[PDB]
Coordinates of C-alpha atoms in Angstrom, one line a residue:
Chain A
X1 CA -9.7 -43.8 -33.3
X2 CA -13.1 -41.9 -34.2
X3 CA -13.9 -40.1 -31.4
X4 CA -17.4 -38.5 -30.2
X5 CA -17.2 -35.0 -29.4
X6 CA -19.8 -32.7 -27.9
X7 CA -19.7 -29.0 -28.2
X8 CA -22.9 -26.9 -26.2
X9 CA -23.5 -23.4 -27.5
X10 CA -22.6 -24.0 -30.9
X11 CA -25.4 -22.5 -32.4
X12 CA -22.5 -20.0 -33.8
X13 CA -19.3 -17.6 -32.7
X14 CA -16.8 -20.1 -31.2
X15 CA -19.0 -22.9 -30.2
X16 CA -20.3 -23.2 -34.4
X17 CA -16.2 -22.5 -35.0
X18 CA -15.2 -25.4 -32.6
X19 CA -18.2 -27.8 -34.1
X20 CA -16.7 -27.1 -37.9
X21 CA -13.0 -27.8 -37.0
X22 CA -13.8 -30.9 -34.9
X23 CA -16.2 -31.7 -37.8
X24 CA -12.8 -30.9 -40.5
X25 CA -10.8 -33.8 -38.4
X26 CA -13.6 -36.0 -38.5
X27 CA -14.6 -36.4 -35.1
X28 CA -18.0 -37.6 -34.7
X29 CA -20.4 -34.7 -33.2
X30 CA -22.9 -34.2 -30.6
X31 CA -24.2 -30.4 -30.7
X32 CA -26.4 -28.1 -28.6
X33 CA -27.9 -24.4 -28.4
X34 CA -30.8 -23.0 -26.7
X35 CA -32.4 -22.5 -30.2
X36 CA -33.0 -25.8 -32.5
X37 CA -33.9 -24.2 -35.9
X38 CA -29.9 -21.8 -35.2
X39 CA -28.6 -24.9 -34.2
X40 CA -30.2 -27.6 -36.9
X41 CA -28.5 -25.1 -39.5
X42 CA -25.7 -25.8 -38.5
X43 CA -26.1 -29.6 -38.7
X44 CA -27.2 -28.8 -42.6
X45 CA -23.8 -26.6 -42.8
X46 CA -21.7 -29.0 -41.7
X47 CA -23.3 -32.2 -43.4
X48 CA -23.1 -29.8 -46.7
X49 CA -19.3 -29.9 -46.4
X50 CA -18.9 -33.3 -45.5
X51 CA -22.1 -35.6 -46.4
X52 CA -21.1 -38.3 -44.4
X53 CA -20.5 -36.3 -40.7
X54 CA -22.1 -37.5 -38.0
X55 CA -24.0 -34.9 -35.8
X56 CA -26.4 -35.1 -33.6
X57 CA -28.7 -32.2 -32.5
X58 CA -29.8 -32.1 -29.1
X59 CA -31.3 -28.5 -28.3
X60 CA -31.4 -27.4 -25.0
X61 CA -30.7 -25.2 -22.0
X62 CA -26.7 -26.1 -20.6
X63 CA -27.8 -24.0 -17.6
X64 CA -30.3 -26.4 -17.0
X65 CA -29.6 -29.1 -14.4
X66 CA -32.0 -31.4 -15.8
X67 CA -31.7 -30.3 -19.2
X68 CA -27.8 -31.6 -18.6
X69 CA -28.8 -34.9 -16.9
X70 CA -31.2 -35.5 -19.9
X71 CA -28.7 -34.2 -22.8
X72 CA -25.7 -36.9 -21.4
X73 CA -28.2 -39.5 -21.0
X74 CA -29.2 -39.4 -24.6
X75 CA -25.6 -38.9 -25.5
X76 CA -24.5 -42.0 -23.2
X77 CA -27.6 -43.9 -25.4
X78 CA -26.7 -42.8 -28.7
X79 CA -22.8 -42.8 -28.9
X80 CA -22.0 -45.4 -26.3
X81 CA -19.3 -43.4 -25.7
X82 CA -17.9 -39.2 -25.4
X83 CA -14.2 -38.3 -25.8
X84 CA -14.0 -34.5 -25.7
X85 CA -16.1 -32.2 -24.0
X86 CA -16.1 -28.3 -25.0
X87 CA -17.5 -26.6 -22.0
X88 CA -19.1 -23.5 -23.6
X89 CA -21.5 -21.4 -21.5
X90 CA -21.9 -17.4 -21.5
X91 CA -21.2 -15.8 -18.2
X92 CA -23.4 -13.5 -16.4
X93 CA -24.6 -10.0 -17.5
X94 CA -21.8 -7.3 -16.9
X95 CA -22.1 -6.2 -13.3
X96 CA -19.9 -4.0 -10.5
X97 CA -18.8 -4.0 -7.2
X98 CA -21.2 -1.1 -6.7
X99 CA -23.9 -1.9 -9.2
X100 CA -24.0 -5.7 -8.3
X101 CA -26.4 -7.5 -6.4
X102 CA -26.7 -11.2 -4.9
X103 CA -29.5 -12.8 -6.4
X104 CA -28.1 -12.5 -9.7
X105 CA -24.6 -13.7 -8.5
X106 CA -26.2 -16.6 -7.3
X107 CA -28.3 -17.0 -10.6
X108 CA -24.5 -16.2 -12.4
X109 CA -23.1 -18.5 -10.5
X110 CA -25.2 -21.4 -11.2
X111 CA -25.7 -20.7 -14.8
X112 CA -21.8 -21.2 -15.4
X113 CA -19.9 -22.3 -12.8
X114 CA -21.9 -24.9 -11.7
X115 CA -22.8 -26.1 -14.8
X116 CA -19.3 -26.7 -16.2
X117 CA -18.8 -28.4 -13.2
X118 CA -21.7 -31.0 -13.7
X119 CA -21.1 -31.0 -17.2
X120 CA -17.7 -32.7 -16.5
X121 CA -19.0 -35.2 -13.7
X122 CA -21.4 -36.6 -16.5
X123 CA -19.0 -36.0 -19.2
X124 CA -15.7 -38.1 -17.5
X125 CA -17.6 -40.6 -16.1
X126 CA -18.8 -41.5 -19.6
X127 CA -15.1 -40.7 -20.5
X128 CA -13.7 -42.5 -17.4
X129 CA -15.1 -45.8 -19.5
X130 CA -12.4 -45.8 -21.9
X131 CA -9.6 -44.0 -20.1
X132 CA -9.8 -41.5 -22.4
X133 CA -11.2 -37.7 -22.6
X134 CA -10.3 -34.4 -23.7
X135 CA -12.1 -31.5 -21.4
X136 CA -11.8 -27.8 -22.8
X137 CA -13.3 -25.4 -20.9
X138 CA -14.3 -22.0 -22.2
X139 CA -13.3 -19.2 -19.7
X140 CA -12.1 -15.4 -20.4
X141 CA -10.5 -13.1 -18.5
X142 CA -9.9 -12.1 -14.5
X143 CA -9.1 -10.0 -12.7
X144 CA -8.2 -6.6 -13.1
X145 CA -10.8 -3.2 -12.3
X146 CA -14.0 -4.3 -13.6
X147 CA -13.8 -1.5 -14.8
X148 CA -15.0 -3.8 -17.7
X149 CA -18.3 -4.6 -15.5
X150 CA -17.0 -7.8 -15.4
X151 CA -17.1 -8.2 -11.6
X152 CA -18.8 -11.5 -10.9
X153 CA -17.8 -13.3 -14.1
X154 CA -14.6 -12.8 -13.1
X155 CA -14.6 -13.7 -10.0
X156 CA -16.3 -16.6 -11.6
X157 CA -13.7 -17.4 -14.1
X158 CA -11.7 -17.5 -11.1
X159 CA -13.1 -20.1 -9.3
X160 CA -13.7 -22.3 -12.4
X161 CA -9.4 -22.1 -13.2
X162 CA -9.2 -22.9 -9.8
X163 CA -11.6 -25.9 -10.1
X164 CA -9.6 -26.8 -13.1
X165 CA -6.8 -27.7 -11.6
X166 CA -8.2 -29.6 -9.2
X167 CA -10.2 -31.9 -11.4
X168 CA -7.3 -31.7 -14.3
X169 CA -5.7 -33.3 -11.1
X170 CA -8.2 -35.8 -10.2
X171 CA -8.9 -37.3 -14.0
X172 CA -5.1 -37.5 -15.3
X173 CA -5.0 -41.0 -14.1
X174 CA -7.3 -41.5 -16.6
X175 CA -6.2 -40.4 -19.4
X176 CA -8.3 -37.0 -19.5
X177 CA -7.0 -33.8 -20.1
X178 CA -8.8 -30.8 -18.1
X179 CA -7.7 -27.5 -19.7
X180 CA -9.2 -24.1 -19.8
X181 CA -8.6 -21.8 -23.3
X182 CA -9.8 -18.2 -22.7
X183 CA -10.5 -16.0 -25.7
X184 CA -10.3 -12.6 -26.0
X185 CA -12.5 -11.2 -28.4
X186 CA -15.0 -12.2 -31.3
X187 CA -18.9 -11.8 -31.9
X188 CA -20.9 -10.6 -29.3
X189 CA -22.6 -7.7 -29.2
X190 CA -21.0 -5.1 -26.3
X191 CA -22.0 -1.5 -26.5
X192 CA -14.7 3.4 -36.3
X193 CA -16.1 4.2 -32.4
X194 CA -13.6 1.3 -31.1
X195 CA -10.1 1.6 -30.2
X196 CA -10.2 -1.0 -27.9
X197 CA -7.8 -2.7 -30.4
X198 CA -5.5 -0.3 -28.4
X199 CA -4.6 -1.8 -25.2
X200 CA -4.2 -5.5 -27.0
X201 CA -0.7 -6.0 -28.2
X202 CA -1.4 -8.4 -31.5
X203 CA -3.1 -4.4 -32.1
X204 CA -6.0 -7.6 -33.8
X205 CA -9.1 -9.0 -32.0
X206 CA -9.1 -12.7 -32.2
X207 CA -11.4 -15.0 -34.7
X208 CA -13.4 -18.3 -33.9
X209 CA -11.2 -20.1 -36.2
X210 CA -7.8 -19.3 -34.3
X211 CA -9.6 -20.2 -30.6
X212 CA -11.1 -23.0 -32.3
X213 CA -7.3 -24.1 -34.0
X214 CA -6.3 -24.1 -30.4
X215 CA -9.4 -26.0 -28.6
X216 CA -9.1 -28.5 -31.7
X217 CA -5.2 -29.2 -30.7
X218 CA -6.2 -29.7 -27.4
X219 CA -8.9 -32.0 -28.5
X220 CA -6.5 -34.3 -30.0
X221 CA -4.6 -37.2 -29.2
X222 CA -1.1 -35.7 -29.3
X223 CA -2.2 -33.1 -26.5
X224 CA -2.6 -36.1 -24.2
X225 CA 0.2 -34.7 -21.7
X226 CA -1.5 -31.3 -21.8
X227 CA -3.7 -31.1 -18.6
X228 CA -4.6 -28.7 -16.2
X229 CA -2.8 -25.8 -17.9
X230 CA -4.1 -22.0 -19.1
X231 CA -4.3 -21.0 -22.5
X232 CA -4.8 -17.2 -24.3
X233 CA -6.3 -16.8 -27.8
X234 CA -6.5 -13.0 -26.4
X235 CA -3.2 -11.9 -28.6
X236 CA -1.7 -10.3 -25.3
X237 CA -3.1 -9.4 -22.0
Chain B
X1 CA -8.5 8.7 15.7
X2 CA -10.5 6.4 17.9
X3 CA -11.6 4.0 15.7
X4 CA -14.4 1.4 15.7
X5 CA -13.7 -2.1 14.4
X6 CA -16.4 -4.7 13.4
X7 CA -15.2 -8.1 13.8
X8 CA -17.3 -10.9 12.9
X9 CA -17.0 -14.6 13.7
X10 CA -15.1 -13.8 17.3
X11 CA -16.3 -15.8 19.9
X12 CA -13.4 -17.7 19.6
X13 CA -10.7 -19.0 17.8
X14 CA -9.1 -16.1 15.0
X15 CA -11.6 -13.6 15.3
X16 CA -11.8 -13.7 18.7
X17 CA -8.0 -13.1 18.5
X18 CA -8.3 -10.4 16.6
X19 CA -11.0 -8.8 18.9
X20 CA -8.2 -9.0 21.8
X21 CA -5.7 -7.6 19.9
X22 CA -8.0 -4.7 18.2
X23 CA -8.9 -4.3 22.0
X24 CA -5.3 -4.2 22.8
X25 CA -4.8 -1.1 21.0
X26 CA -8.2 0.6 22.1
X27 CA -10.0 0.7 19.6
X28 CA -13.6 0.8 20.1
X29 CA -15.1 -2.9 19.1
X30 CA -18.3 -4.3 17.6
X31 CA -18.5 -8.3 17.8
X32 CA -19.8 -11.2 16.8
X33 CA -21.2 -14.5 16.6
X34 CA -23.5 -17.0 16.3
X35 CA -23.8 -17.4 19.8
X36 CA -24.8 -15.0 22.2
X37 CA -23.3 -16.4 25.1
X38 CA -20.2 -17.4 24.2
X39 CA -19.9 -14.1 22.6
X40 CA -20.6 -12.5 25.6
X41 CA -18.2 -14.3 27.7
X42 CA -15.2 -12.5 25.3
X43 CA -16.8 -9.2 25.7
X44 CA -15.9 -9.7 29.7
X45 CA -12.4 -11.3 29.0
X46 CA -12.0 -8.0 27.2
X47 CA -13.3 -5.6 29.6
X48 CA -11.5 -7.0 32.3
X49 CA -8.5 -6.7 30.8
X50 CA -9.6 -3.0 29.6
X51 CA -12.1 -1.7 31.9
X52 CA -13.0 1.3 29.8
X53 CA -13.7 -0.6 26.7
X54 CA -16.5 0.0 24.6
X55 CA -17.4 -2.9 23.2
X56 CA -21.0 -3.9 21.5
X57 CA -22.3 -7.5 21.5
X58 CA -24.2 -8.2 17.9
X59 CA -25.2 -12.3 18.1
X60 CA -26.2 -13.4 14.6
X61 CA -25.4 -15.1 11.9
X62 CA -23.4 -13.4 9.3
X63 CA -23.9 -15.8 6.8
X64 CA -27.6 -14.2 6.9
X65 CA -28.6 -11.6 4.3
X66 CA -31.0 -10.1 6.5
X67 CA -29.2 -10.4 9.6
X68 CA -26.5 -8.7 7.8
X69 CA -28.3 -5.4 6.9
X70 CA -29.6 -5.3 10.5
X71 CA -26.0 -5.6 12.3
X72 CA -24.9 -3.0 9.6
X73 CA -28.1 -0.8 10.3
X74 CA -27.0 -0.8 14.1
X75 CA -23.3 -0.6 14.1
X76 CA -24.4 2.4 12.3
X77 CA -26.7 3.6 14.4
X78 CA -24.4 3.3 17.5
X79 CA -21.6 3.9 16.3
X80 CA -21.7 6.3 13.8
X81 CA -18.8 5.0 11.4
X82 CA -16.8 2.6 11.0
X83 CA -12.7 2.1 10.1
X84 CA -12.6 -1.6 10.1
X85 CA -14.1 -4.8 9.1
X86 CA -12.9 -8.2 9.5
X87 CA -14.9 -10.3 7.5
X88 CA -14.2 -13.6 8.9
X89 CA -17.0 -16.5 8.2
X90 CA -16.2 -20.0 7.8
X91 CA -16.3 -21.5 4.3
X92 CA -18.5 -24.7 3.6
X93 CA -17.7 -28.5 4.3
X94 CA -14.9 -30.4 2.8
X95 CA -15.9 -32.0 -0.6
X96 CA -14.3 -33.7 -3.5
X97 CA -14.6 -33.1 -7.5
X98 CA -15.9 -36.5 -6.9
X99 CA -18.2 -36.7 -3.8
X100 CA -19.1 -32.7 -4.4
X101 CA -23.1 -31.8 -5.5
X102 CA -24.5 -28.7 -6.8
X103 CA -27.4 -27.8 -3.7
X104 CA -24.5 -27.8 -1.2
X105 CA -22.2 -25.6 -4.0
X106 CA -24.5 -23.1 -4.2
X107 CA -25.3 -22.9 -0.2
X108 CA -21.4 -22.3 0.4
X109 CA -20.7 -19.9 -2.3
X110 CA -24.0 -17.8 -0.5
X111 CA -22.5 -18.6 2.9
X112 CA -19.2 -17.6 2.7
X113 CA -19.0 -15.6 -0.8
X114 CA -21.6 -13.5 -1.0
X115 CA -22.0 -12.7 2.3
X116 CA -17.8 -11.3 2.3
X117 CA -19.0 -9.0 -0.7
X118 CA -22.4 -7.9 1.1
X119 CA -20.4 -6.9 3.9
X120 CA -18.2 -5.2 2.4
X121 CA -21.0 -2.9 0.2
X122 CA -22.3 -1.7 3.7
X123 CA -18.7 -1.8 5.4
X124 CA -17.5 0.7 2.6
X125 CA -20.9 3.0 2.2
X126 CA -20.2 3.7 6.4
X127 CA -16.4 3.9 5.9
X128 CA -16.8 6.0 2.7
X129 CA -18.2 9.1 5.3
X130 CA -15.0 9.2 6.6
X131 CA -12.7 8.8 3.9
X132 CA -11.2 5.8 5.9
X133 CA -11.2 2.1 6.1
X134 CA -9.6 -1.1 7.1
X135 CA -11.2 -4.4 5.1
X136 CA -9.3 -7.5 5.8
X137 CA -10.8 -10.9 4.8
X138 CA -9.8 -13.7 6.4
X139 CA -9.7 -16.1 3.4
X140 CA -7.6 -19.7 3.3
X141 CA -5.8 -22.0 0.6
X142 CA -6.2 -23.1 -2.7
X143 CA -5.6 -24.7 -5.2
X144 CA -3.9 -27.9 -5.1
X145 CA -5.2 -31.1 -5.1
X146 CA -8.0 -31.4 -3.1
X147 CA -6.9 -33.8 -2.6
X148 CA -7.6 -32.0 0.5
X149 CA -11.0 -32.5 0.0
X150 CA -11.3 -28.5 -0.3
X151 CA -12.6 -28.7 -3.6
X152 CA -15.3 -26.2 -3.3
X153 CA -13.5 -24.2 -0.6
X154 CA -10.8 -23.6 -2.7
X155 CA -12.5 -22.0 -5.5
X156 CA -15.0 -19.9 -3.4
X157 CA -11.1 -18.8 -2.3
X158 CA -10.2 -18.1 -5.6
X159 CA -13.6 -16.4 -6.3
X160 CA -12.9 -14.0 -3.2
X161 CA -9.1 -13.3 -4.1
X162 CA -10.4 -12.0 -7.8
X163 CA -13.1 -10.1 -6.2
X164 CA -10.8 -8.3 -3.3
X165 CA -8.5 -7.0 -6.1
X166 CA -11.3 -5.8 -8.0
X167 CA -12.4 -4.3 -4.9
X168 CA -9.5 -3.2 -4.1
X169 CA -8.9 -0.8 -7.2
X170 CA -12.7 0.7 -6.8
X171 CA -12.4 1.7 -3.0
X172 CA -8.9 2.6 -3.1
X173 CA -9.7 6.5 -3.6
X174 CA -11.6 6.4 -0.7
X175 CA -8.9 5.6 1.6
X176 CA -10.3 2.5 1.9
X177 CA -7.8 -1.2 1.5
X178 CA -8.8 -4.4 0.9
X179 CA -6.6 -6.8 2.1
X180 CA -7.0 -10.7 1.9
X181 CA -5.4 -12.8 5.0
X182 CA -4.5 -16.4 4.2
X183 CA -4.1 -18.2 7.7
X184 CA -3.2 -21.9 7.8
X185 CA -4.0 -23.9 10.8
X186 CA -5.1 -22.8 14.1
X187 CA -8.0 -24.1 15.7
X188 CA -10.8 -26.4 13.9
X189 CA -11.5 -29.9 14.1
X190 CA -10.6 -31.6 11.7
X191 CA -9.9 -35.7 11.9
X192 CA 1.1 -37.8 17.5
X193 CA -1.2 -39.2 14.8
X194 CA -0.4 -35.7 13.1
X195 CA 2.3 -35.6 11.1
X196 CA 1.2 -32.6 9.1
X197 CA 3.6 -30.5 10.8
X198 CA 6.1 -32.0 8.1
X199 CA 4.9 -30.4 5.0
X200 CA 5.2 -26.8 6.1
X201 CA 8.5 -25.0 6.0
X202 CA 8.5 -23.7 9.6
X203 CA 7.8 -27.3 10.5
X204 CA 5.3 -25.4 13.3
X205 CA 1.5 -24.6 12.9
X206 CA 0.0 -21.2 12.9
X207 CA -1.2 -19.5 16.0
X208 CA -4.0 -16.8 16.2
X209 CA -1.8 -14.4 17.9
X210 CA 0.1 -14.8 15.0
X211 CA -2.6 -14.4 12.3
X212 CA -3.7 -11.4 14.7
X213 CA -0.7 -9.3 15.0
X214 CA -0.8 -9.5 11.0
X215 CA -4.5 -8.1 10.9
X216 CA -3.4 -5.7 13.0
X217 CA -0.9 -4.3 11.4
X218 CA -3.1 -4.3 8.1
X219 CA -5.9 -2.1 10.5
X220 CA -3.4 0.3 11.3
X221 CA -3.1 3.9 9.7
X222 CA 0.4 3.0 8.9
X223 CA -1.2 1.0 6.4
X224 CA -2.7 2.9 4.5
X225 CA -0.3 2.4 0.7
X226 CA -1.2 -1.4 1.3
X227 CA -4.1 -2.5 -0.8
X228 CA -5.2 -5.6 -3.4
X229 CA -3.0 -7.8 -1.5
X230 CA -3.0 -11.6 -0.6
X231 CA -0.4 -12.5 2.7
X232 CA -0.7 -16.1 4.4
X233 CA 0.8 -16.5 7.7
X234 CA 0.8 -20.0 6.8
X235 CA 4.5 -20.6 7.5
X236 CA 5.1 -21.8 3.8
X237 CA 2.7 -23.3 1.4

């Protein structure tokens, strides 16, 4: 068929990566970033290597409850339909156990978590119309000493596998993969000066293209008995 | 030592098992609940069995940020230290991936979440003094299929199991573990007529003495290798 797809945050990194592969197989595209000019380049990018794409550009903040309400309705009045979904939200700022504090884990948790979470209950019920749907959410890594300042993202990314499962659970019965793919490493900032390519077995960090080879695969038809399962692009824990 | 325990959530049910059996091997208690009365009333049940208890009555909702810090600031002021916590607050209502929304998310990860984590910043900073402490969170099921209508419960569980481990690592050169306890049924609500008994390997349902002896244990200074981990006394998943 010729599927819709919409991937947020794809102004560039592995959102832009995701949007180019998707555009490769000829999926029909729905994109968004907080910035419109990042984001309409994109549109030109892709249209440049295939003149007859169609993307759509709707700018926006994902974070946004009514921003998301606003973005499927148009999506819902444009397409008619929406296929795949690429949940793709930053976490939080890096915080600790001892530097941490609760309005921002509240804010953290919103800004993510949440947001997936709405994201999906707009995106399958559009989906849900005909019993079909590809949801890819894009989660990193738990749980171990942050130690990487990754306290409350992680125990974010905890709860959002968790609610994966359930939903993947939920939505099989209609033909709608839930799956989370967790990179490991690409572009975004962080603070030779780097041998943190010791401690990750592949000795590599990854590339957009190889997580987006992998959220692409899941996108597809073929990975239609693929559902609430947990994927590494991370080249070893 | 003669060590004080804070034990919240205790007029009844699990905590207030816990209190008995803290009680039950003298040491010196700090309770709590919502309710001042029937919080009171277990303070008596203890004393009478143990006369020379010393046991301190805090009413108030734990859930509270600011009620929080003021419990903390008094158990401090009182007591002078503290070994143990027993973070025990109950998580949210039931929901479903379906019926969930996104105000009522938010409330329960603050309720239950949060308020674990809060508790445990000022729990530790008191038990740091002494290089010693107990923290044992009562925390429940995931992940599967709520299904159980747990859908938000169970990854505010998830959430808290990550964050323990984390925890766990951080405080663990302070003498201090963080242990998660998974009960499974005891007393709650809830809607023969009950066969739920048949689903659980010890074809029997939990009982607070049960779930108590096991906090115990994990309070004790035999205890004290035993850290970052997750037991149920569910009886089987």
């Amino acid at each position: 068929s010729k599927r819709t797809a919409f991937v947020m945050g794809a102004s560039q990194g592995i959102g832009k990566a995701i949007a180019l592969k998707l555009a490769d197989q000829h999926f029909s595209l729905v994109i968004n970033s907080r910035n419109l000019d990042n984001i309409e380049s994109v549109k030109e990018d892709i249209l440049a290597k295939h003149p007859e794409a169609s993307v759509i550009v709707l700018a926006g903040d994902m974070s946004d409850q009514h921003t998301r309400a606003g973005i499927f309705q148009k999506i819902e009045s444009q397409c008619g339909r929406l296929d795949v979904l690429i949940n793709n939200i930053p976490g939080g700022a890096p915080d600790t156990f001892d530097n941490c504090n609760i309005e921002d884990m509240t804010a953290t948790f919103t800004q993510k978590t949440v947001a997936y979470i709405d994201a999906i209950k707009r995106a399958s019920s559009l989906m849900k119309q005909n019993e079909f749907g590809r949801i890819i959410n894009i989660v990193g890594n738990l749980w171990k000493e942050p130690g990487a300042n990754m306290f409350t993202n992680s125990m974010m990314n905890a709860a959002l596998i968790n609610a994966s499962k359930n939903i993947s659970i939920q939505l099989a019965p209609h033909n709608i993969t839930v799956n989370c793919l967790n990179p490991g490493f690409i572009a975004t900032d962080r603070y030779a000066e780097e041998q943190i390519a010791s401690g990750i077995p592949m000795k590599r960090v990854g590339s957009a293209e190889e997580t987006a080879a992998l959220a692409a695969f899941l996108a597809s038809e073929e990975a239609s008995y693929i559902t609430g399962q947990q994927i590494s692009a991370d080249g070893g824990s």
